[PDB]
Design a protein around this ligand. Structure first.
Ligand code: A1BFF
Length: 185
C-alpha cells in the first residue's frame, strides 16, 4: 500500500484506560499490570476489559498508524466512536461503534457481527491501520508481510468522531504480558 504519507502521531489517553493498565511516560506503550494501578475510577474507564483509547479524535481526512504486537497471544486493534459504551459487557461490532480485528486462540478475526475469519499466512509483528473518514473505510495491513492487506471495512457508518482503539488482552496464560507499542513514523 501507499498510505504511509497519512501517518499520524498517536498517544494513549490514561483517563480512558482500564485501571490495571500501565501506560508508558511517553504515552506510546501500554501493558497489563499484575494488579490495580492505584488510579481513581471515572466514567471514561473501560471496566470489564483491558482497553484504552488514543487521545486523538478524527472527524475528517485520511489517517495511518502502526502498532507492534510482538509475542502477544491476544489483542484487539482498530478505531471506535468517541461515544462507545465503557461499562459492562459488550461485543466489538460496527453496530456498537467499533471497527476492529483481533487475535484470539491462534486465529485472527475481523470484528463484524458475526465475526469474520482472516487468512494470514505470516503472523504479524506490526499492524498498519488506515482510516478514510469521508470514504467510510477502515483497512488493516500486515507490516511483517510487506504491507499485505488483512481486512477492509467499507460502507462504514462512523456516526461521530473516531478514536484509536486498543485492547492488550487478558494474561491468564502467563504468555500475554507483552505490551502494545505505537511504532515510530
Ligand atoms: C483487566 C481487569 O479489569 N481485571 C479485573 C479482574 C481480574 C483480571 C485479572 N488479570 S489477568 C487476566 O490475569 O491478567 C484483571
Amino acid at each position: 500500500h501507499h498510505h504511509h504519507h497519512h501517518m499520524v502521531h498517536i498517544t494513549l489517553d490514561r483517563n480512558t484506560a482500564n485501571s490495571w493498565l500501565i501506560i508508558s511516560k511517553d504515552r506510546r506503550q501500554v501493558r497489563m499490570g499484575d494488579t490495580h494501578q492505584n488510579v481513581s475510577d471515572n466514567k471514561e474507564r473501560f471496566s470489564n476489559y483491558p482497553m484504552v483509547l488514543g487521545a486523538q479524535r478524527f472527524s475528517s481526512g485520511k489517517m495511518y498508524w502502526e502498532v507492534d504486537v510482538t509475542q502477544k497471544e491476544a489483542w484487539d486493534l482498530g478505531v471506535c466512536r468517541d461515544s462507545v459504551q465503557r461499562k459492562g459487557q459488550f461485543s466489538l461490532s460496527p453496530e456498537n461503534g467499533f471497527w476492529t480485528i483481533w487475535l484470539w486462540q491462534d486465529s485472527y478475526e475481523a470484528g463484524t457481527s458475526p465475526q469474520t475469519t482472516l487468512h494470514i499466512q505470516v503472523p504479524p509483528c506490526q499492524i498498519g491501520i488506515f482510516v478514510d473518514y469521508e470514504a467510510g473505510v477502515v483497512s488493516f495491513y500486515n507490516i511483517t508481510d510487506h504491507g499485505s492487506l488483512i481486512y477492509t471495512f467499507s460502507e462504514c457508518v462512523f456516526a461521530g468522531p473516531l478514536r484509536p482503539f486498543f485492547n492488550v488482552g487478558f494474561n491468564y496464560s502467563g504468555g500475554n504480558a507483552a505490551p502494545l507499542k505505537l511504532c515510530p513514523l
